[PDB]
Amino acid sequence: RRDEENVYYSKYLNDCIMEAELHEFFSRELVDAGYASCSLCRTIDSICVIIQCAEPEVVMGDNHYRLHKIEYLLAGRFMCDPKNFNIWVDKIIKRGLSAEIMVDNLRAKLEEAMPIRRAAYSIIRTAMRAGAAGCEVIVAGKLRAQRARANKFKEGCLISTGHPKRIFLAEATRHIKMRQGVIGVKVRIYNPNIRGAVMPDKIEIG
């Protein structure tokens, strides 16, 4: 027979919302660092964050002053006692392969005057360079005439329907807003590079 109050089972939920709130602040202020994912490691109420970034020094910038204002902004926001919050950013190898970095690197060219097909193939170049099986860039919105539509530019085979899809493929959606209207851009990258699983279709023989 057991007591069911289990008081502690809500704190990991608050931590789950925190990871969410941490993602929403990070993709707002750490886009030039290529922010991908953030982690929460509090065991003794010791806050630890591992931001994933294309290059990590990009996050620290100036002897960690840039990080610390935002480290104690995180503390202030989450009622975390100041200085308990600590962020050790990790550097991302194969920066282009990660989807969130790639979709952002497109919004960065598109918000100016770069062509769509030119930057679609520019983004595709990074995924082939990063050993992705394929990269697909789907831009949507008011391209050309006011009546909107989408251009899908895929190089290399890409999968997206199945359980492998949520084990090998990765993706992100950047809602870029331009001068005429909202032209959301979304780039998916299929990578069979993951060593956590092998496609159950793939077979190797003597």
Binding site: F25, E29, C41, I50, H68, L73, A75, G76, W88
Partner: protein, 109 residues
């Protein structure tokens, strides 16, 4: 408006102490978090909610702070030149106490 003078000094020093003022964004009267210190001479606890918010737009437009509202809570941060504005108006002659806590050591993940 006609808010008390103490709040202007209270937010500046707190904004510099944490080098940020993420603010609960509430247009409803209720507990006012962050600047619990509004000096004394009238209060020994937090000031009116409206005062920080109305001041925050004034600071953001002038450029003393930069704001990136995310979820309901605001994510206000003291800007690079804010350090000069805050330090000069508080009459601090030299660079005072901000927020850095050394450099983190490699973590398990």
């Amino acid at each position: 408006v006609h808010i008390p003078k103490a709040v202007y000094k209270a937010v500046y020093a707190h904004l510099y102490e944490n080098a940020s003022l993420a603010l609960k964004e509430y247009w409803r009267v209720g507990n006012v978090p962050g600047i619990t210190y509004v000096d004394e001479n009238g209060k020994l606890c937090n000031p009116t909610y409206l005062h920080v918010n109305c001041i925050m737009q004034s600071l953001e437009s002038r450029g003393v702070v930069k704001d990136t509202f995310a979820w309901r809570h605001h994510y206000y941060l003291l800007t690079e030149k804010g350090e000069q504005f805050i330090r000069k108006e508080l009459d601090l002659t030299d660079d005072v106490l901000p927020t850095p806590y050394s450099k983190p050591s490699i973590k398990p993940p």
